[PDB]
Each structure stands twice: as C-alpha cells, then as structure tokens.
Amino acid sequence: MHRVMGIETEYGISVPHQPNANAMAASSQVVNAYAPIGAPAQRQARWDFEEENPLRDARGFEVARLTDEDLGLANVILTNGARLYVDHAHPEYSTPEVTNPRDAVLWDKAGERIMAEAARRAADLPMGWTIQLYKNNTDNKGASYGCHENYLMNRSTPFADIVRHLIPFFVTRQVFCGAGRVGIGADGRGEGFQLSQRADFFEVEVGLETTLKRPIINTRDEPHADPEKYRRLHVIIGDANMSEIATYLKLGTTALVLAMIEDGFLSQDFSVESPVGALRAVSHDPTLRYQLRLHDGRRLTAVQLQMEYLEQARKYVEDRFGTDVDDMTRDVLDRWETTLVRLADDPMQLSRDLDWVAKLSILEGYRQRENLPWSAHKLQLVDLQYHDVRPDRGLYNRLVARGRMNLLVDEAAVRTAMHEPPNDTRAYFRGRCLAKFGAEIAAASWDSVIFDLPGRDSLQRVPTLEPLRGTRAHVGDLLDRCRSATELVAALTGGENLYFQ
C-alpha cells in the first residue's frame, strides 16, 4: 500500500476546578508547553479548514490586528514531522505525511503521547494549569469535534465518482471504525448506546463546511502538493480511535476503496436512500441488524454492504497485482474480512480489536454490577474515561497496560515516533533538519524549511513541494555527512549533483 495520507485529531480538553474555563487559553497552554521540543510554523503552515478560527483569512492563515493565547494562534512543527496547534478551540495534532495505514497508526499514536506530555509540562510551568485531554469527539453538551483524515488523490479522478462510491462506504464503515457513544441525539439525552460519536452531528451529503451543517463528503480539496496534479480528499465523518486495529482498518480500507475509484474499477451502484438518515440509523443499532435501503431496492445490513466493498477490493487487487500483492494490502484485506465475519456472528468477540466493542464491554460490566440503565450519568463518565490520554486514567490505556488489546506497533516504536519522522516522505527531511540543524532553522511548514545561515544576509528557503521527495533514500546520507546547515544548503542548491526535492 502506498498513498500519501494523514490524520488531524482535535482533542477534547477540560480544566478541572475552573467552571466555563477558557478552552482557547487552555489549548494554547498545551501547545506552548511543548514548543521547546520543536520550531515555529510559518504563516502558511495550515490546513484549509483552519479558516474556521479567529483572526484568519480564507485559507486559515493568521492576519494582522486580545492576546495570542486567547486567539489560539500557537502553531509548532515537531521533529517527527508533525504539527501541533489550536483548532476549534481545542489542541490539534496533525501527523507527518505517511504512505500507509500502519505508519498512520504509529505517528498518530505518538500524537497521543505528545498530547499527554504537553499537558504534564503545562502544569509544571509557573502559573500553569492542570489540564485533562481526551481523544474523543464529543463534550456531552451538544458539541462535536473532528478527527480528520486526508488522502492524496489524482486531480483527474471525477469527483462525482468519488462521491457516489464513497457515501455508502462512509455510512457503513462505523461498524468497525466507531468508537461508541452513550446517549442518542446530538444532545445525548436519548437513552441508549450507539456505534459512533460523530453520526448525530451530520446534516447533509456533500458540502464545504466542517464545524456546522456537516457533510458526509466534505468538499475541501486543497492539497499540500501541486493542485494541478493532485486532489486532497478531506474526510471528517470518522471518530477518533484509540484501538490501533480500528485506526488501521479505517485508513487502510478507505485507501483500497480510493484505489478502486481512481482506476474506474467499480461498476456497481451502492447508492443508499437518505444517506444521512442511514448514517444515524446504523449508528443507533449496535446489534448490527438494521438493514439499509439501497436506491435499487436491495436491503443490506451495514456489515453486508461492507462485505460487498471487501469483495470488490479483493477482485481489484487480484486483477491489478495478481500474486505480487504487497504484505500490507494483503493484511488489510484479511483483517477487514475477518472483522466483518466476526461482526455478523457475535461482535463481542472483537473486544480486543474495536473501540465500540471494548467500550461496550466495560459499560455492560457497570450495568450488570450496579443495575444502571443507559440514562445513568456514571455511564457517560465511563464513556469519556475510555479516551483519557493519561496512561493510568484512560480505560483504553489501562486495557493496553494489561495486554488486553491487539496492537500493530510496540510502545518502543511509539516513543521513537514522538521524535523521529517517517522515512518515506518529505517529513523525513523536515524532521531530521529540525533535530540536527535546529539551531539554524527560523521556521518550517509543509512546503519549506527556512534556514538562517551565519554570514548570509537573507534567510534561505528550501522548498519541499512534493510529499514523496526528501525521503531517507533521497537525503539521509546527505544529512548524515553535513556538519552545518550551510553545508546542507550548498549541497541542495548545487547544480551538478542534483537533489530533486
């Protein structure tokens, strides 16, 4: 599997003992508490959806003309290639560019560790606050926050085909991607458990908005790459996942569907009547019996429709690659199929793999011990605890501490990924430059690193416009042998020994 992708996760935030506490200021404290470990972001170090914050232009870039803390402007580039910032009045982590779902899992998991460490550091600074962070999507006050996925696609792929084949897939993906939620409806006052945190907050099929009138297919399309060649697919429908298996399947199955769409492989029409209604109805039935209504009149459970996408993906891979299928593609297909088979038989068999199942198992334990109905406030507390970033307080983290969840990566790899970038994207160059040459870097962003060389009047901008250049294979040996940023820049700007970047 090889496709540029990423995850941007907005974290829930709470400052105990401070009623109505300024979430913007708390979020700035979290980000600023980790700033010593990275470098300032340039003005353009922004995703398009950051337009929905104070004091920005149409691109999310800060404009001129209240303190910057109360405005949530803090924006830091990390040595692992990630970015840490404030969005929608919450701390947000954007992974480095990665090329496959296992690396997405790894650097996204490092983000949870970075958030936990940032909150710990914020408390230690003088006048600093004690701050709790949650990797979930709702605050139980009718508010929702986003876990965004980005996938780099060919600009020539017809958008109408992207929409028509992705909607039924996104309506049903929650059977394995959902994180679970206690309470039904946006206000959470309806009684019961549902598969997804986000489903109740969606209103339309296709649209540009992200923080209101939310669409199943968001149309923001601006890539961190040449827009003539590439489209960014920006997905906002998914819950933040704790389980590594859930995040892996979320990104990996979506990437396989995108490959089928780009190659024109799908001839079926999986269109669903009233997809927003179906999104909610699937979420609200954790017994997995609800049968969607397809436009052609077929009736299929969400699991059954996912199985139709799986069957197409297997045929696509067999026809395109034959017996030269790469290990990760084979693994995603096998885990997708096994998960769907087990979901149809007994979802509770998946408690080591899926967030909503692991969470439901904990909640049912409380219901059995204490004779609690679904409306009991304690169950909403337990729902939230599942997502706490602290290693001893988050319930997912306590399951992992006991070896009770399946993992794709080990903790030593997660710790390394807090500070070292992926090797196969431009995040390598960016992260390694910040680590080795940080003394001579003024700022960085997805598109360039800005060097300040002693004895040179002007700052030196090194562009990094292509996400698949500047990898370890391209520049690792050069970075190893250079002793200063002056030597590095002289090599990169030389016309005889060319570095294509």
Rounded Cα distance between 47 and 223, Å, is 9
Q: Is 104 strand, coil or helix?
A: helix
Euclidean distance between CA atoms 262 and 231, whole angstroms? 11
Are 451 and 441 in contact by the 8 Å Cβ rule? The answer is yes
| Beta carbons of 237 and 177 less than 8 angstroms apart | no
Q: What single letter denotes the amino acid at residue 274?
A: S
**CA 188/CA 143 separation, integer angstroms:** 10
To one decimal place, what's the resolution in Å?
Answer: 1.4
Q: Is 439 exposed, middle or buried (0-12, 13-18, 19+ CB in 10 A)?
A: exposed
Q: What angle do CA 473, 478, 479 make, to 5 degrees?
A: 95
Domain boundaries, the chain: 18-493
Which residue bears the tokens 């049912």?
364
Annotation-wise, does 445 bind a ligand? no
Residue (of 39, 42, 123) closest to 76 by Cα position: 39
CA 181 to CA 198: how far, in whole Å? 9
Nearest to 134 by CA among 242, 245, 22: 242
Q: Is 411 labelled as part of a ligand binding site?
A: no
Does 287 appear as a known binding residue?
no
| CA of residue 316 relative to chain centroid, distance | 26
Q: Which residues are catalytic?
A: 87
Q: Is 92 annotated as a binding residue?
A: yes
Q: Closest by alpha carbon to 292, among 161, 165, 172?
A: 172
Distance CA 436, CA 426 (A): 16
Q: Which of 96, 83, 90 is nearest to 44 (CA)?
A: 83
- 95 is an annotated ligand-binding site residue: yes
Q: How was this structure determined?
A: X-ray
**C-alpha triplet 212, 215, 217: angle, nearest 5°:** 145
Cα radius of gyration rounded to whole Å, the chain: 23
For residue 459, the tally of other CB atoms under 10 A from its CB is: 12
Coil, strand, or helix at residue 497? coil
Q: For residue 463, give the H/E element and its range.
A: strand 460-463
Residues 6+ away with beta carbon under 8 Å from 145 = 10, 11, 12, 88, 90, 137, 138, 139
Question: Which residue bears the tokens 């890539």?
Answer: 223
First to last CA, the chain: 22
232 labelled ligand-binding: yes
